[PDB]
Amino acid sequence: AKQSLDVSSDRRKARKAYFTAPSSQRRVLLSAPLSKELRAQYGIKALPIRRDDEVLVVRGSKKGQEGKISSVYRLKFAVQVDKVTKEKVNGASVPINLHPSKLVITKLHLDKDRKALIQRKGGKLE
Amino acid sequence: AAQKSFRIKQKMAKAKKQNRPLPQWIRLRTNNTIRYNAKRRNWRRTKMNI
Amino acid sequence: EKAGHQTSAESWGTGRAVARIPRVGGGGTGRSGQGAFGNMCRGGRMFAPTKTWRKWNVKVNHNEKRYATASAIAATAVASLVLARGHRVEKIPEIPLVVSTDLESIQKTKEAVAALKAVGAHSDLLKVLKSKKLRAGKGKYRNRRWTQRRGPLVVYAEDNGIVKALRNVPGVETANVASLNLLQLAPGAHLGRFVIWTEAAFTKLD
Amino acid sequence: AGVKAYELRTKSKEQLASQLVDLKKELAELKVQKLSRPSLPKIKTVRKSIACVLTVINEQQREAVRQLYKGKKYQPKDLRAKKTRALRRALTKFEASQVTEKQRKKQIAFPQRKYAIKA
Amino acid sequence: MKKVEDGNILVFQVSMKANKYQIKKAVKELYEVDVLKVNTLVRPNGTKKAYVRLTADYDALDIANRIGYI
Amino acid sequence: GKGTPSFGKRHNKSHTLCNRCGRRSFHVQKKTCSSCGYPAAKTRSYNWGAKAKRRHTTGTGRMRYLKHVSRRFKNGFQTGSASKASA
RNA sequence: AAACUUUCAACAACGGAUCUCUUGGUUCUCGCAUCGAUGAAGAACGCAGCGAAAUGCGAUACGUAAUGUGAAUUGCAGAAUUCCGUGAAUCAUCGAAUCUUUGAACGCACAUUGCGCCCCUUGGUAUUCCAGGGGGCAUGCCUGUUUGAGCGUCAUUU
RNA sequence: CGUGGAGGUCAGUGACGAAGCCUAGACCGUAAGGUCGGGUCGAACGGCCUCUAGUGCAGAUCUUGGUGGUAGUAGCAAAUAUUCAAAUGAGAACUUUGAAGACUGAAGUGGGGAAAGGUUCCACGUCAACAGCAGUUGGACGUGGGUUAGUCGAUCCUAAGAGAUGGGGAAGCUCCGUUUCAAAGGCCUGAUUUUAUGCAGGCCACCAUCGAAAGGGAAUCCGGUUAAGAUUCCGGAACCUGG
RNA sequence: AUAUUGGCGAGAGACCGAUAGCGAACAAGUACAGUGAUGGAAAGAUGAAAAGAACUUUGAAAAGAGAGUGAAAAAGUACGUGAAAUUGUUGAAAGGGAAGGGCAUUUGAUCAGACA
Numbered sequence A: 001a002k003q004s005l006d007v008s009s010d011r012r013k014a015r016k017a018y019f020t021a022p023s024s025q026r027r028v029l030l031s032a033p034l035s036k037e038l039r040a041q042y043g044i045k046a047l048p049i050r051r052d053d054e055v056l057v058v059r060g061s062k063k064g065q066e067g068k069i070s071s072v073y074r075l076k077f078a079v080q081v082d083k084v085t086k087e088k089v090n091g092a093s094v095p096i097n098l099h100p101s102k103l104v105i106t107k108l109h110l111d112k113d114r115k116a117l118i119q120r121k122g123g124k125l126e
Numbered sequence B: 001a002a003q004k005s006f007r008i009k010q011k012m013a014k015a016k017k018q019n020r021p022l023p024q025w026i027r028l029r030t031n032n033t034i035r036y037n038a039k040r041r042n043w044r045r046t047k048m049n050i
Numbered sequence C: 001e002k003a004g005h006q007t008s009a010e011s012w013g014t015g016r017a018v019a020r021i022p023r024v025g026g027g028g029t030g031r032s033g034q035g036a037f038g039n040m041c042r043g044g045r046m047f048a049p050t051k052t053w054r055k056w057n058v059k060v061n062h063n064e065k066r067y068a069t070a071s072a073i074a075a076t077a078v079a080s081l082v083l084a085r086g087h088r089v090e091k092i093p094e095i096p097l098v099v100s101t102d103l104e105s106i107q108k109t110k111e112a113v114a115a116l117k118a119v120g121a122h123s124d125l126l127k128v129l130k131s132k133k134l135r136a137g138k139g140k141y142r143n144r145r146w147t148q149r150r151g152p153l154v155v156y157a158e159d160n161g162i163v164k165a166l167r168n169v170p171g172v173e174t175a176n177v178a179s180l181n182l183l184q185l186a187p188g189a190h191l192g193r194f195v196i197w198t199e200a201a202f203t204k205l206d
Numbered sequence D: 001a002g003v004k005a006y007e008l009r010t011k012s013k014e015q016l017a018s019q020l021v022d023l024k025k026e027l028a029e030l031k032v033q034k035l036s037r038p039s040l041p042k043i044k045t046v047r048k049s050i051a052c053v054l055t056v057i058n059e060q061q062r063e064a065v066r067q068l069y070k071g072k073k074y075q076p077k078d079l080r081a082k083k084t085r086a087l088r089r090a091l092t093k094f095e096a097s098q099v100t101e102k103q104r105k106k107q108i109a110f111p112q113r114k115y116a117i118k119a
Numbered sequence E: 001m002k003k004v005e006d007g008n009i010l011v012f013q014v015s016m017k018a019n020k021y022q023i024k025k026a027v028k029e030l031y032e033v034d035v036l037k038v039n040t041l042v043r044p045n046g047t048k049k050a051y052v053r054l055t056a057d058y059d060a061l062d063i064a065n066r067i068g069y070i
Numbered sequence F: 001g002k003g004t005p006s007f008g009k010r011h012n013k014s015h016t017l018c019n020r021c022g023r024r025s026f027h028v029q030k031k032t033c034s035s036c037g038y039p040a041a042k043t044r045s046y047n048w049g050a051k052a053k054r055r056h057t058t059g060t061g062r063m064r065y066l067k068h069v070s071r072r073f074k075n076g077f078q079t080g081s082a083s084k085a086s087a
Numbered sequence G: 001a002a003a004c005u006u007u008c009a010a011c012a013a014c015g016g017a018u019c020u021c022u023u024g025g026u027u028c029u030c031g032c033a034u035c036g037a038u039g040a041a042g043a044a045c046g047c048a049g050c051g052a053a054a055u056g057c058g059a060u061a062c063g064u065a066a067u068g069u070g071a072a073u074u075g076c077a078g079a080a081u082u083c084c085g086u087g088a089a090u091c092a093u094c095g096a097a098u099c100u101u102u103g104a105a106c107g108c109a110c111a112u113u114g115c116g117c118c119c120c121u122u123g124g125u126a127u128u129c130c131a132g133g134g135g136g137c138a139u140g141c142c143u144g145u146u147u148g149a150g151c152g153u154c155a156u157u158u
Numbered sequence H: 001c002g003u004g005g006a007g008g009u010c011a012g013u014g015a016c017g018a019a020g021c022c023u024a025g026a027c028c029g030u031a032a033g034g035u036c037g038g039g040u041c042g043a044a045c046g047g048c049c050u051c052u053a054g055u056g057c058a059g060a061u062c063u064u065g066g067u068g069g070u071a072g073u074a075g076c077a078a079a080u081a082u083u084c085a086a087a088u089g090a091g092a093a094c095u096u097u098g099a100a101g102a103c104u105g106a107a108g109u110g111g112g113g114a115a116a117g118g119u120u121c122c123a124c125g126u127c128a129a130c131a132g133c134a135g136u137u138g139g140a141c142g143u144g145g146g147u148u149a150g151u152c153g154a155u156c157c158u159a160a161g162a163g164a165u166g167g168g169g170a171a172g173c174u175c176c177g178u179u180u181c182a183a184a185g186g187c188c189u190g191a192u193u194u195u196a197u198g199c200a201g202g203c204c205a206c207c208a209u210c211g212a213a214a215g216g217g218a219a220u221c222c223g224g225u226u227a228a229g230a231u232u233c234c235g236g237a238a239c240c241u242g243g
Numbered sequence I: 001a002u003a004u005u006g007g008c009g010a011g012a013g014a015c016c017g018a019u020a021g022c023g024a025a026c027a028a029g030u031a032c033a034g035u036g037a038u039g040g041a042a043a044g045a046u047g048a049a050a051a052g053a054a055c056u057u058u059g060a061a062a063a064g065a066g067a068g069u070g071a072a073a074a075a076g077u078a079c080g081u082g083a084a085a086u087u088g089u090u091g092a093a094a095g096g097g098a099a100g101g102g103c104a105u106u107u108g109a110u111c112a113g114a115c116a
């Protein structure tokens, strides 16, 4: 149970700050858990997903499929993986939108700042 | 009319500019909700009280 | 309390083939002409608007309040009552159920669930948990979304961990003897709460 | 692209005046283009750049004056703190800490003592 | 464009805050041209239009597609 | 004749635009605004006209300056600039 | 006997009840004290590569500066040098700026983009006319500064 | 008996289909009502003991919405009037062009303006709505273009009148007064040849200001030109004010 | 210490659930009316995802018929469910100046239960 006085269980208040969250917050909301491998590898459970990362869909209909995240569609609360798409009837192609809580991260894209984050959660890296 | 003050002409000017159809591309934006311009005005349907 | 009444509407009076409720004046907008104020009017003020000075709380005579909490304590023995009340207590040693004072010093949830188990709670503990349902009401979206049974009521004499250690297991409630609450001793006014007393707590009683 | 502020501020006064001109010719010419081309978003970045230069030219002229008024009664009103109109007319700490000869004598002689009960 | 070709006349949309004097000078200065006279009007979208006539030495058409339109 | 053939002669403005509120409530012969009071130094308003007030109080507008006073209050009316750090 | 009328039903109309939703409303409670001549609240007109609005902003115009973040923005186009970086972003923060025409609104006016005066400076052969750039000129009142008025009135000249 | 919400409980029902809706199918109750089947549906919901109220509709010339009979009915009949052919077009009584027949009859159905509108002007495209038949047409719809001045107006002046100011009333929003019991202001040049402008005369005491696109008032004409501007552009020939 | 239907920031409810709740859950003090003061609405919901229907055919076109997408088009930007008045079609019946109703039975249609 909540115990603080600056946290609220109000459902209306919650649903508002979800849907009206600014991009910067949507970055963190949109997180994916690392793969079982990478979790040992880095001593860390999850991460705000970031573009050129490598990922495995572990839930849903494209379950099993993998690829590179090609954009983070923050506006849409959605992530698009370069390799997982819809072929149409006019055989034109269209990104399927995936939810990072349904990916598993398989190869991080690393910056100084990325490594710096991993270290701030008190993780390790290879 | 027909020999106006610059203030009235100005207003008339601004009103010309607002007197166009919804720009169709907006219809395509995510969550777009506007279907048409619902503030359109026609000179023989509603006078613009100056 | 300004609602329904933010119009300058008049009656048109009779002679106009039309009812005598007040009506919104002016024109050009379709609101105008329409019934105003009346409780049977769309947009009207309601009949007898609710008011905050309605009496919300209620006084009970302190002594009678005791007569009740006392009564409710008395029925926490009396296994039939407890049994009849929800409360899975067929397979518990005896009633009142009194458990070692050492309980009050347990720091850690898992240790606490383990304890309660051992002394017989298990089947009641599973009755919460197996019973979480989505509230049927409109209540479900007024910060009351889920629903569920009541667990046992662990009563202690001194809190040395026990509250924080149980505070997160579904259904269970703790109480310091010195207090002891009617709302908890007889939930929904049905007598027979399954109480687990610590020794210290059981003795402070007298 | 787009000019960067931190690189602008090293540039001399009369280099920024000239860039501002270059950028203006630039902008002028894009505008001639924009009416042939079916889109011209390059023009955005050039007029955001002019902003930047002006900002900086005004920036440095201000912190010039700001200092040759530093530490003296009376400095241009628009270098003075803004605060709030009221806040502005509130007494200064000095004017408020102010105390009567007679009062202070008393404050000294009998000040509020620290004390405690028990024994 | 017809005024440019046939009239030795540059047409510019020009600042509202600006008069015949300021228009004339700014054309002179921004374009290395001599100006005969300047006629203005206010378009019905609230923008100033300047019919700028160059003197006989200059050729607005050249001068037109040297600033780069056509 | 009091009806429509007299409506025919309705072509002269009693009010033009109010410079202060822009509302076509500037009584030409009276030279004052029936809505906002101009040129009276004070703005016209009345406690029997609440909807009227509500139609015009602060915050029905841009609040160009008042917008930011409570931010400025929150940060104790800081002067000077923000420093720097890392990553 | 059709047609027609009426009743029931199935499918299909009309219409939008009902059920389930809720980034809204209402009411309670706690904490807090900050508008303006340093031009407020309010108005008008503008500003985007492609916008009529809503939101935002002011000719530096859906924004400039700074700071934190650490890679988007996205309807389409776009940049491409911005991704181990004084660095993406319709991000957050915000301490620095820009802030048209106005408004208590202040040179005079104002159903007018109407009409003066002063200073500095630039062009036209110009202290004097014209033009461009910048900077100024409301009212009551307080302290003070200077210039003054009155046989109100003191002394002092020869 | 039935509704919305609340405490307890049945470890109640449910995406293997909750709720809702439909159904001259079934069953229980004297009745309020309750239960089931089938169809439709798509995310929630109920039994029991208690608690609670914005709790049960046929009416109120009730409120708001929706819908009928009336009825393919009243009607679409003032302003003399239309016709042949071609072109176009899916489509022509109605558009374009030609022909013909007429009308308004310069007190106009002509040619322009004021007030008011504000883009209706003009071109191109073009018929879903609108133009109470129609529509290929439009003052509609889409997309563009277009309003050029020293001399035309405004701007200046004063009219009825409005209205600041020293003031006088008024608790006060404000009311009175307009040269009124006010120390009300500015021109011409001289004195400068430290120098830019102090003093030297002499005057003049008029005391705001707004208020006319028909009153007063400095000055421009003809010819040509555009899809749409013209005493405004071009051509030529003038005139006024200031310097 | 007291006040507070304003302002900034928070935590809540046996509260309302789109004709309710503030007038406004939406480009709502908007659109629209009025010379003016002022008056002042209607209007939320495809689906997980536009996958928003390629292609063929009839048509001047809008569309229709196919195909296709989808868990479902008995979800087609008229979009969740989709009642009622009222309507079209189909099927069955009845009808000599209204219709509907009560007790009762014939006739048609339709159906539960119980037999063993």
Ligand SMILES: [Mg+2]
Binding pocket: none
């Ligand atoms: Mg983290």
Ligand SMILES: [Mg+2]
Binding pocket: A076, A077, A078, A099
């Ligand atoms: Mg999603």
Ligand SMILES: [Mg+2]
Binding pocket: none
């Ligand atoms: Mg009309």
Ligand SMILES: [Mg+2]
Binding pocket: B047
């Ligand atoms: Mg009207």
Ligand SMILES: [Mg+2]
Binding pocket: C001, C002, C005
């Ligand atoms: Mg009341």
Ligand SMILES: [Mg+2]
Binding pocket: C017, C018
């Ligand atoms: Mg009637």
Ligand SMILES: [Mg+2]
Binding pocket: C003, C004, C043, C044, C045
């Ligand atoms: Mg109401």
Ligand SMILES: [Mg+2]
Binding pocket: none
């Ligand atoms: Mg319900």
Ligand SMILES: [Mg+2]
Binding pocket: C133, C136, C147
């Ligand atoms: Mg339940």
Ligand SMILES: [Mg+2]
Binding pocket: none
């Ligand atoms: Mg930038």
Ligand SMILES: [Mg+2]
Binding pocket: D080
């Ligand atoms: Mg100061």
Ligand SMILES: [Mg+2]
Binding pocket: E005, E059, E061
């Ligand atoms: Mg030539």
Ligand SMILES: [Mg+2]
Binding pocket: E040, E041
């Ligand atoms: Mg002109």
Ligand SMILES: [Mg+2]
Binding pocket: F007
């Ligand atoms: Mg009328």
Ligand SMILES: [Mg+2]
Binding pocket: F014, F029
């Ligand atoms: Mg009048």
Ligand SMILES: [Mg+2]
Binding pocket: F030, F031, F032
């Ligand atoms: Mg008056």
